[PDB]
mmCIF file with all atom_site columns, C-alpha atoms in Angstrom:
data_model
loop_
_atom_site.group_PDB
_atom_site.id
_atom_site.type_symbol
_atom_site.label_atom_id
_atom_site.label_alt_id
_atom_site.label_comp_id
_atom_site.label_asym_id
_atom_site.label_entity_id
_atom_site.label_seq_id
_atom_site.pdbx_PDB_ins_code
_atom_site.Cartn_x
_atom_site.Cartn_y
_atom_site.Cartn_z
_atom_site.occupancy
_atom_site.B_iso_or_equiv
_atom_site.pdbx_formal_charge
_atom_site.auth_seq_id
_atom_site.auth_comp_id
_atom_site.auth_asym_id
_atom_site.auth_atom_id
_atom_site.pdbx_PDB_model_num
ATOM 1   C CA . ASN A 1 1  ? -0.543  22.056  -48.804 1.00 0.00 ? 1  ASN A CA 1
ATOM 2   C CA . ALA A 1 2  ? -0.272  24.520  -45.922 1.00 0.00 ? 2  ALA A CA 1
ATOM 3   C CA . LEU A 1 3  ? -3.437  23.227  -44.243 1.00 0.00 ? 3  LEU A CA 1
ATOM 4   C CA . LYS A 1 4  ? -2.210  19.656  -44.749 1.00 0.00 ? 4  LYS A CA 1
ATOM 5   C CA . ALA A 1 5  ? 1.176   20.384  -43.175 1.00 0.00 ? 5  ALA A CA 1
ATOM 6   C CA . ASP A 1 6  ? -0.577  22.106  -40.277 1.00 0.00 ? 6  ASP A CA 1
ATOM 7   C CA . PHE A 1 7  ? -2.802  19.045  -39.892 1.00 0.00 ? 7  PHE A CA 1
ATOM 8   C CA . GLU A 1 8  ? 0.221   16.758  -39.623 1.00 0.00 ? 8  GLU A CA 1
ATOM 9   C CA . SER A 1 9  ? 1.805   19.158  -37.133 1.00 0.00 ? 9  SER A CA 1
ATOM 10  C CA . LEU A 1 10 ? -1.237  19.234  -34.846 1.00 0.00 ? 10 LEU A CA 1
ATOM 11  C CA . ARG A 1 11 ? -1.456  15.444  -35.071 1.00 0.00 ? 11 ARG A CA 1
ATOM 12  C CA . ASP A 1 12 ? 2.157   15.233  -33.876 1.00 0.00 ? 12 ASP A CA 1
ATOM 13  C CA . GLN A 1 13 ? 1.498   17.594  -30.968 1.00 0.00 ? 13 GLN A CA 1
ATOM 14  C CA . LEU A 1 14 ? -1.603  15.577  -30.066 1.00 0.00 ? 14 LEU A CA 1
ATOM 15  C CA . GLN A 1 15 ? 0.510   12.423  -29.947 1.00 0.00 ? 15 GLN A CA 1
ATOM 16  C CA . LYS A 1 16 ? 3.077   14.178  -27.751 1.00 0.00 ? 16 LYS A CA 1
ATOM 17  C CA . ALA A 1 17 ? 0.367   15.432  -25.393 1.00 0.00 ? 17 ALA A CA 1
ATOM 18  C CA . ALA A 1 18 ? -0.931  11.865  -25.163 1.00 0.00 ? 18 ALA A CA 1
ATOM 19  C CA . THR A 1 19 ? 2.545   10.500  -24.410 1.00 0.00 ? 19 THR A CA 1
ATOM 20  C CA . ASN A 1 20 ? 3.247   13.077  -21.693 1.00 0.00 ? 20 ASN A CA 1
ATOM 21  C CA . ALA A 1 21 ? 0.077   12.388  -19.645 1.00 0.00 ? 21 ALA A CA 1
ATOM 22  C CA . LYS A 1 22 ? 1.294   10.438  -16.631 1.00 0.00 ? 22 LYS A CA 1
ATOM 23  C CA . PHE A 1 23 ? 1.671   11.066  -12.894 1.00 0.00 ? 23 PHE A CA 1
ATOM 24  C CA . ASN A 1 24 ? 4.599   9.413   -11.081 1.00 0.00 ? 24 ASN A CA 1
ATOM 25  C CA . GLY A 1 25 ? 5.053   6.750   -13.742 1.00 0.00 ? 25 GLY A CA 1
ATOM 26  C CA . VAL A 1 26 ? 1.407   5.726   -14.252 1.00 0.00 ? 26 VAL A CA 1
ATOM 27  C CA . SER A 1 27 ? -1.215  6.974   -16.685 1.00 0.00 ? 27 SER A CA 1
ATOM 28  C CA . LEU A 1 28 ? -4.915  6.605   -17.440 1.00 0.00 ? 28 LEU A CA 1
ATOM 29  C CA . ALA A 1 29 ? -4.718  8.144   -20.936 1.00 0.00 ? 29 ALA A CA 1
ATOM 30  C CA . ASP A 1 30 ? -1.418  6.961   -22.464 1.00 0.00 ? 30 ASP A CA 1
ATOM 31  C CA . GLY A 1 31 ? -2.743  3.393   -22.629 1.00 0.00 ? 31 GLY A CA 1
ATOM 32  C CA . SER A 1 32 ? 0.230   1.957   -20.731 1.00 0.00 ? 32 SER A CA 1
ATOM 33  C CA . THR A 1 33 ? -2.119  -0.352  -18.805 1.00 0.00 ? 33 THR A CA 1
ATOM 34  C CA . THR A 1 34 ? -5.701  -1.553  -19.130 1.00 0.00 ? 34 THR A CA 1
ATOM 35  C CA . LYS A 1 35 ? -6.642  -0.421  -15.607 1.00 0.00 ? 35 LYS A CA 1
ATOM 36  C CA . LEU A 1 36 ? -5.442  0.750   -12.206 1.00 0.00 ? 36 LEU A CA 1
ATOM 37  C CA . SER A 1 37 ? -7.104  -0.762  -9.122  1.00 0.00 ? 37 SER A CA 1
ATOM 38  C CA . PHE A 1 38 ? -6.986  1.724   -6.249  1.00 0.00 ? 38 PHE A CA 1
ATOM 39  C CA . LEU A 1 39 ? -7.525  0.620   -2.661  1.00 0.00 ? 39 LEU A CA 1
ATOM 40  C CA . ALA A 1 40 ? -11.076 0.511   -1.342  1.00 0.00 ? 40 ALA A CA 1
ATOM 41  C CA . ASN A 1 41 ? -11.138 -1.049  2.132   1.00 0.00 ? 41 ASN A CA 1
ATOM 42  C CA . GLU A 1 42 ? -8.805  -2.439  4.783   1.00 0.00 ? 42 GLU A CA 1
ATOM 43  C CA . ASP A 1 43 ? -9.479  -6.025  3.633   1.00 0.00 ? 43 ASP A CA 1
ATOM 44  C CA . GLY A 1 44 ? -7.728  -5.386  0.315   1.00 0.00 ? 44 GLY A CA 1
ATOM 45  C CA . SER A 1 45 ? -10.864 -4.547  -1.663  1.00 0.00 ? 45 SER A CA 1
ATOM 46  C CA . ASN A 1 46 ? -9.966  -2.504  -4.730  1.00 0.00 ? 46 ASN A CA 1
ATOM 47  C CA . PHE A 1 47 ? -11.534 0.557   -6.338  1.00 0.00 ? 47 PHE A CA 1
ATOM 48  C CA . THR A 1 48 ? -10.610 -0.137  -9.969  1.00 0.00 ? 48 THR A CA 1
ATOM 49  C CA . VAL A 1 49 ? -11.092 2.338   -12.813 1.00 0.00 ? 49 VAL A CA 1
ATOM 50  C CA . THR A 1 50 ? -10.373 1.259   -16.375 1.00 0.00 ? 50 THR A CA 1
ATOM 51  C CA . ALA A 1 51 ? -7.816  3.338   -18.242 1.00 0.00 ? 51 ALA A CA 1
ATOM 52  C CA . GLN A 1 52 ? -9.309  5.479   -20.998 1.00 0.00 ? 52 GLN A CA 1
ATOM 53  C CA . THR A 1 53 ? -6.724  5.516   -23.778 1.00 0.00 ? 53 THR A CA 1
ATOM 54  C CA . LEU A 1 54 ? -6.165  8.866   -25.477 1.00 0.00 ? 54 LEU A CA 1
ATOM 55  C CA . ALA B 2 1  ? 5.340   -26.881 58.136  1.00 0.00 ? 1  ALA B CA 1
ATOM 56  C CA . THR B 2 2  ? 2.640   -26.544 55.481  1.00 0.00 ? 2  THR B CA 1
ATOM 57  C CA . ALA B 2 3  ? 2.070   -22.885 56.363  1.00 0.00 ? 3  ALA B CA 1
ATOM 58  C CA . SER B 2 4  ? 5.803   -22.223 56.018  1.00 0.00 ? 4  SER B CA 1
ATOM 59  C CA . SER B 2 5  ? 5.972   -24.189 52.754  1.00 0.00 ? 5  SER B CA 1
ATOM 60  C CA . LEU B 2 6  ? 3.253   -22.021 51.170  1.00 0.00 ? 6  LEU B CA 1
ATOM 61  C CA . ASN B 2 7  ? 5.711   -19.117 50.778  1.00 0.00 ? 7  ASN B CA 1
ATOM 62  C CA . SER B 2 8  ? 7.441   -20.877 47.879  1.00 0.00 ? 8  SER B CA 1
ATOM 63  C CA . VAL B 2 9  ? 4.080   -21.282 46.135  1.00 0.00 ? 9  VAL B CA 1
ATOM 64  C CA . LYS B 2 10 ? 3.514   -17.549 46.534  1.00 0.00 ? 10 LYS B CA 1
ATOM 65  C CA . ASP B 2 11 ? 6.973   -16.889 45.099  1.00 0.00 ? 11 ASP B CA 1
ATOM 66  C CA . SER B 2 12 ? 6.260   -19.091 42.082  1.00 0.00 ? 12 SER B CA 1
ATOM 67  C CA . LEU B 2 13 ? 2.916   -17.432 41.351  1.00 0.00 ? 13 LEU B CA 1
ATOM 68  C CA . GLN B 2 14 ? 4.576   -14.018 41.536  1.00 0.00 ? 14 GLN B CA 1
ATOM 69  C CA . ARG B 2 15 ? 7.404   -15.143 39.241  1.00 0.00 ? 15 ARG B CA 1
ATOM 70  C CA . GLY B 2 16 ? 4.765   -16.265 36.767  1.00 0.00 ? 16 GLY B CA 1
ATOM 71  C CA . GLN B 2 17 ? 3.065   -12.891 37.005  1.00 0.00 ? 17 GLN B CA 1
ATOM 72  C CA . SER B 2 18 ? 6.378   -11.267 36.089  1.00 0.00 ? 18 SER B CA 1
ATOM 73  C CA . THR B 2 19 ? 6.874   -13.698 33.195  1.00 0.00 ? 19 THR B CA 1
ATOM 74  C CA . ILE B 2 20 ? 3.514   -13.003 31.556  1.00 0.00 ? 20 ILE B CA 1
ATOM 75  C CA . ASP B 2 21 ? 4.171   -9.309  32.227  1.00 0.00 ? 21 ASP B CA 1
ATOM 76  C CA . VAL B 2 22 ? 7.358   -9.442  30.150  1.00 0.00 ? 22 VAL B CA 1
ATOM 77  C CA . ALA B 2 23 ? 5.545   -11.455 27.484  1.00 0.00 ? 23 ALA B CA 1
ATOM 78  C CA . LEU B 2 24 ? 2.823   -8.800  27.210  1.00 0.00 ? 24 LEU B CA 1
ATOM 79  C CA . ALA B 2 25 ? 5.433   -6.033  27.143  1.00 0.00 ? 25 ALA B CA 1
ATOM 80  C CA . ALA B 2 26 ? 6.899   -7.667  24.045  1.00 0.00 ? 26 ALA B CA 1
ATOM 81  C CA . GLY B 2 27 ? 3.504   -8.577  22.588  1.00 0.00 ? 27 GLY B CA 1
ATOM 82  C CA . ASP B 2 28 ? 2.572   -4.906  22.412  1.00 0.00 ? 28 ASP B CA 1
ATOM 83  C CA . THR B 2 29 ? 5.566   -4.318  20.141  1.00 0.00 ? 29 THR B CA 1
ATOM 84  C CA . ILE B 2 30 ? 4.675   -7.418  18.137  1.00 0.00 ? 30 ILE B CA 1
ATOM 85  C CA . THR B 2 31 ? 1.140   -6.164  17.499  1.00 0.00 ? 31 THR B CA 1
ATOM 86  C CA . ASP B 2 32 ? 2.385   -2.695  16.544  1.00 0.00 ? 32 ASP B CA 1
ATOM 87  C CA . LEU B 2 33 ? 4.902   -4.176  14.107  1.00 0.00 ? 33 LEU B CA 1
ATOM 88  C CA . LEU B 2 34 ? 2.192   -6.419  12.649  1.00 0.00 ? 34 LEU B CA 1
ATOM 89  C CA . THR B 2 35 ? -0.025  -3.376  12.132  1.00 0.00 ? 35 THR B CA 1
ATOM 90  C CA . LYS B 2 36 ? 2.807   -1.577  10.340  1.00 0.00 ? 36 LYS B CA 1
ATOM 91  C CA . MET B 2 37 ? 3.460   -4.652  8.187   1.00 0.00 ? 37 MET B CA 1
ATOM 92  C CA . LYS B 2 38 ? -0.214  -4.788  7.240   1.00 0.00 ? 38 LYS B CA 1
ATOM 93  C CA . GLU B 2 39 ? 0.039   -1.062  6.470   1.00 0.00 ? 39 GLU B CA 1
ATOM 94  C CA . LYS B 2 40 ? 2.952   -1.658  4.108   1.00 0.00 ? 40 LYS B CA 1
ATOM 95  C CA . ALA B 2 41 ? 1.522   -4.699  2.324   1.00 0.00 ? 41 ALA B CA 1
ATOM 96  C CA . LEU B 2 42 ? -1.868  -3.003  2.027   1.00 0.00 ? 42 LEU B CA 1
ATOM 97  C CA . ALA B 2 43 ? -0.388  0.138   0.470   1.00 0.00 ? 43 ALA B CA 1
ATOM 98  C CA . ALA B 2 44 ? 1.785   -2.065  -1.767  1.00 0.00 ? 44 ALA B CA 1
ATOM 99  C CA . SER B 2 45 ? -1.266  -3.934  -3.080  1.00 0.00 ? 45 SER B CA 1
ATOM 100 C CA . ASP B 2 46 ? -2.270  -0.877  -5.139  1.00 0.00 ? 46 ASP B CA 1
ATOM 101 C CA . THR B 2 47 ? -1.351  -1.219  -8.823  1.00 0.00 ? 47 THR B CA 1
ATOM 102 C CA . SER B 2 48 ? -0.933  2.546   -9.361  1.00 0.00 ? 48 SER B CA 1
ATOM 103 C CA . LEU B 2 49 ? 2.405   2.683   -7.538  1.00 0.00 ? 49 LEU B CA 1
ATOM 104 C CA . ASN B 2 50 ? 5.528   2.990   -9.651  1.00 0.00 ? 50 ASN B CA 1
ATOM 105 C CA . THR B 2 51 ? 8.249   0.368   -9.262  1.00 0.00 ? 51 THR B CA 1
ATOM 106 C CA . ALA B 2 52 ? 10.391  2.599   -7.036  1.00 0.00 ? 52 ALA B CA 1
ATOM 107 C CA . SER B 2 53 ? 7.761   3.317   -4.374  1.00 0.00 ? 53 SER B CA 1
ATOM 108 C CA . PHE B 2 54 ? 6.809   -0.361  -4.446  1.00 0.00 ? 54 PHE B CA 1
#
């Protein structure tokens, strides 16, 4: 029972660490968006990277 | 009489020089403002900005 309660506790802290991963309102691990397309060139070309949900 | 009349033609050509000079003096500002507008729209095209910076 103690190991089980510890397992639930670490699962809760893992969920909190996933929720708190964001920089200035955007995140690549929380899963808030499928991708973020960063700028690549002056013509509006985009350097996309798909978000990796955690 | 023709040689005396030519002075008004010289005056008109010089007035036109001054007019295109003023037009270029404002066109420099227009090109700088267009470059800043392209700067803003280009930075705004990125999807990683939060709603406030956008």
